[PDB]
Design a protein around this ligand. Structure first.
Ligand code: ATP
Ligand code: ATP
Ligand code: ATP
Ligand SMILES: OC[C@H]1O[C@H](O[C@H]2[C@H](O)[C@@H](O)[C@@H](O)O[C@@H]2CO)[C@H](O)[C@@H](O)[C@@H]1O
Ligand SMILES: OC[C@H]1O[C@H](O[C@H]2[C@H](O)[C@@H](O)[C@@H](O)O[C@@H]2CO)[C@H](O)[C@@H](O)[C@@H]1O
Ligand SMILES: OC[C@H]1O[C@H](O[C@H]2[C@H](O)[C@@H](O)[C@@H](O)O[C@@H]2CO)[C@H](O)[C@@H](O)[C@@H]1O
Ligand code: NAG
Ligand code: NAG
Ligand code: NAG
Ligand code: NAG
Ligand code: NAG
Ligand code: NAG
Ligand code: NAG
Ligand code: NAG
Ligand code: NAG
Ligand code: NA
Ligand code: NA
Ligand code: NA
Ligand code: NA
Ligand code: NA
Ligand code: NA
Lengths: 333, 333, 333
């Protein structure tokens, strides 16, 4: 009745408020928010990785054992793209190479000097005819950062194999980026895309860098950290084929690009040798590279009667309490 | 009064609905759900590991420094159970070993060929009298996957020492798998079991594999990833001795068993050497192994008056609103 | 009216209950709990680390490549502070060094003996004139724990460079411990303090140890695990300069101090060599050290109208339902 629609000119809004209440609780809260669903947020995941590619550096070929570290194929690994190599260091005495350590007086060679190649003898010494610096005890000779060294251009073409297995324990549901019908031809020719082809396990390094919105040429020079986020948000009421990984790419060391003091990612490690003599020598390496972190996240939902009962009862109580209160507020005013 | 139990034939259900409301809110929601409790979900954990055992491989003994990687005793480590060893590689030119790279025409040796040992010379060469393949520049000779190599049978008997410390910061509560009264005799003789003996820090590899429902013989051959979940769900209202770790075991790379393309877990690393000459050579290793991930999770609860007041008041409002509404629905109908 | 304040002597409490209801819902729940705010708990973080310092050990200088492992500058690394070095091991036969393996009868050399240097020959042999022990096959000679070795005192002075970048994706908000206006002078001279100077990226190892409430002298000897928690809890309604990292320090392997059986943290790894001959030898290392785990956590909040509407409406319904019920309870009693 037109008297029902408007128990008054205000009262037509009684209906309206009810509509919002009905909509919100039975629409967004019950349905869009899938209140009827039981949720698993304790996702269980595993990631294994392999890198394939070859490159020329220092007039030598580099293969996965050369440029990947650490090697164990985890969800976090570095592809070395640039190196400063200091060959055949031995324990001894020598002058620091860098200008920062420049010396003219043995009094200048004390505690105040920045941390460098070793312990200070407190002596001063000639590095070159033009230059004199403080003397240190340690691995000799010291590293020489005085010219930029090139990157491994080829690295853009290396591939990352990601084998990701996830499980939602509550629903005994298991799936992975590698579908059971995946075949050797597929691995050989499939081309990864976050929308077009979510289940190609092979990712091209250069592609990962571009998705993260980075320029390989710059990134390889500075070194950096990229994140490969893999998201499994699955509605198990829907089809098993509807549950697919969602890939997101970003550069995790965002501070680096905005900073003058530290622009990238590098670290130092050494290769250790011994002479037949049994004297000890090593090759020092300063590795610049791209670190990849594979981060997996997920939640899964399935229909279950228990929540459906509790949520719907909650829905009726709420729509009811809402209507009862809107009437009351209206009655006095 | 019998008139109270049934204010009508329907009205006996008024009581019943009240019972469900009373039960649900003051039973499950208040008690079974421990509403009276304050909860810490920000569990703080630490894990350190050590592996002990010896094995024969390649007619040599292997000890923890040989088969465990990485070595730092973290919550994630690999026990190498199978290896393909390529001894004394040097930088140079040579023919790819695998059949996949088979050659008869130098035109066949170009970009299309799968990633392998190095960069292609574009040349073609003889690997053997029977076989001719493409030529590569890199570490030589290339690896030869043409016969299966055996596993380290003994690995089933290696032991894993897990020292796990957890803390619930809110309650200043600290406990670990290693109880304070644990003694050298105990470490020497205690036998781990998830129900029978939760605080033996020593886990037998073979046992871990069986709990994960895996066959060591197969797992060692393919390589794989097992998860050791340690759960600390503690009711601090209960006794400190009631708070014990709950161990769960599974194989994390579930995709592997269901897939033809990639059945396991392996990775490649190298050992680097130099001649007195100063020419560089390395030993290439393809390691198959079991990776163990120790994953710790927990939440802790203690009685606190503040929630007890708020929850119980919430309980009374809810039982009350429920009864008020059930009466109303009944009155009009 | 004084009749309003007290509709009765009890009824003055009707007002009071309303006050608590008003206060709680519109005070603590709406405001102190920032109900008006939209929250991001899916914090995104990255951490890169570098260690700088030199030390004397075994009458040799040790630099970052010597005492830091693993080297890749992650949020988890070890600074080796103590070592038991076993030089030039070769594959062969020899007697176990430790007293635990003491022998007089070849029958004593069987399965029951604890895991040690290798596989048992089942033979018995003389380690020294005074001592006879079981014979093993493996890397020889076996390690000798018979005298305590010193720590690297200097390690207290090493520095940790932490470059931490975080992002709250929801708000497109990015910040790091390294502010954009940070300069070379700053890195050179700034002194870290959790309250006084949260954005100095350089942390002094000894300082980290003291903040964790530990004695370096003891910690370096046993080895241990320290946690560096970095917390980003930011109110984006407030100023961008108000969002600062909060640093917390602790010792994660708490079980260790309370236990006789295992007091610290150590692990074993080896350096591998080859003779020109091509026979294989290695140097075995038992590393004691401090492991640092950088753990980043955060949540961020910003004002948003959508929650403000829903929360405030929720607030009015709750204050209203509360008052309605308190009146009712009063009317019958
Ligand atoms: N552990 C540390 N203690 C003190 N200063 C450090 C430390 N690690 C890095 N720094 C300084 O912070 C700045 C940026 O470091 P970053 O590694 O990003 O650049 P870098 O030039 O590769 O550093 P370096 O070559 O000195 O190792 C440099 O001035 C570096 O000396
Ligand atoms: N980074 C990668 N790029 C391209 N293909 C890869 C990569 N990593 C692995 N694959 C391929 O995926 C398949 C399964 O890899 P998996 O490592 O499980 O087996 P595998 O035979 O040990 O691999 P391989 O011996 O070639 O390193 C193989 O055909 C392998 O060549
Ligand atoms: N994987 C393991 N299997 C059996 N026992 C172990 C294992 N790891 C450690 N233990 C034992 O637990 C005790 C404490 O180990 P911890 O490493 O803390 O001290 P440790 O003396 O350095 O050990 P070790 O020197 O024997 O490697 C020791 O008795 C040690 O033998
Ligand atoms: O609130 C998180 C929850 O709902 C979200 O809802 C989105 C909706 O999907 C969009 O269409 C748009 O209307 O904005 C809404 C925010 O209120 C998201 O769907 C998702 O984050 C989550 O399920
Ligand atoms: O809902 C999660 C919460 O309660 C759970 O309740 C279980 C109960 O323990 C079982 O006896 C059975 O009745 O199923 C209930 C599910 O509603 C669990 O106890 C636990 O996951 C958690 O505390
Ligand atoms: O309840 C967690 C939530 O509120 C907390 O409130 C604290 C308050 O900050 C203190 O002043 C004191 O009154 O104890 C309250 C606990 O009810 C905290 O502020 C914080 O953990 C969080 O925001
Ligand atoms: C990547 O590989 C393709 C061949 O598939 C080649 O054409 C291209 O030049 C390579 N890019 C780089 C940077 O080496
Ligand atoms: C492989 O299985 C998936 C499972 O959903 C399916 O979507 C896909 O079409 C299948 N591929 C082929 C070639 O049948
Ligand atoms: C080993 O020989 C090198 C030069 O060939 C020399 O520097 C060193 O002193 C020798 N080692 C010993 C222990 O004499
Ligand atoms: C494991 O060790 C026991 C001795 O305690 C031995 O009897 C058994 O044969 C071993 N198993 C394997 C697979 O080596
Ligand atoms: C060691 O302490 C725990 C602490 O709860 C106790 O359960 C156990 O019985 C104790 N063991 C012995 C041998 O007293
Ligand atoms: C080192 O000797 C090996 C063979 O003994 C040879 O292949 C290599 O060319 C030599 N290195 C140099 C730099 O001459
Ligand atoms: C740490 O360095 C300072 C110099 O800045 C020195 O005075 C002090 O003795 C050093 N401490 C240790 C333990 O070496
Ligand atoms: C650097 O920027 C931060 C940003 O909040 C500010 O707090 C600080 O005062 C600035 N430092 C200088 C020297 O201006
Ligand atoms: C290498 O020489 C060492 C001693 O110099 C000897 O122990 C070993 O048997 C030799 N290797 C071979 C394969 O003969
Ligand atoms: Na530098
Ligand atoms: Na595909
Ligand atoms: Na292969
Ligand atoms: Na026990
Ligand atoms: Na020992
Ligand atoms: Na500062």
């Amino acid at each position: 009745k037109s008297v029902v629609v408007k128990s008054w000119t205000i009262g037509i809004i009684n209906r309206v408020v009810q509509l919002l209440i009905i909509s919100y609780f039975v629409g967004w809260v019950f349905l869009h928010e899938k209140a009827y669903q039981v949720r698993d947020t304790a996702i269980e995941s595993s990631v294994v990785t392999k890198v394939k590619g070859s490159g020329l550096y220092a007039n030598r070929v580099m293969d996965v054992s050369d440029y990947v570290t650490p090697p164990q194929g985890t969800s976090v690994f570095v592809i070395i793209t640039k190196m400063i190599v200091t060959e055949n260091q031995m324990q001894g005495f020598c002058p620091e190479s860098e200008e920062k350590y420049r010396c003219v007086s043995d009094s200048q060679c004390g505690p105040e000097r920045l941390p460098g190649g070793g312990i200070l003898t407190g002596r001063c010494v000639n590095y070159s005819s033009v230059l004199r610096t403080c003397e240190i005890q340690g691995w000799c000779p010291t590293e020489v950062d005085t010219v930029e060294t090139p990157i491994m251009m080829e690295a853009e073409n290396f591939t990352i194999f990601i084998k990701n297995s996830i499980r939602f324990p509550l629903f005994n549901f298991e799936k992975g980026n590698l579908l059971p019908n995946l075949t050797a031809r597929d691995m050989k020719t499939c081309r990864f895309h976050p929308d077009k082809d979510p289940f190609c396990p092979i990712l091209r390094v250069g592609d990962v860098v571009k998705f993260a919105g980075q320029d390989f040429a710059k990134l390889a020079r500075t070194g950096g950290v990229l994140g490969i986020k893999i998201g499994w948000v699955c509605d198990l009421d829907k089809a098993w084929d509807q549950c697919i990984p969602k890939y997101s790419f970003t550069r995790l060391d965002s501070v680096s690009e905005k900073s003058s003091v530290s622009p990238g990612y590098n670290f130092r490690f050494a290769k250790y040798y011994k002479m037949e003599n049994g004297s000890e020598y090593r090759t020092l390496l300063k590795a610049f590279g791209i670190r990849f972190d594979v981060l997996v996240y997920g939640n899964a939902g399935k229909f279950n009667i228990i929540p459906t009962i509790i949520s719907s009862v909650a829905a009726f109580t709420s729509v009811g309490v809402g209507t009862v209160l809107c009437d009351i507020i209206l009655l006095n005013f």
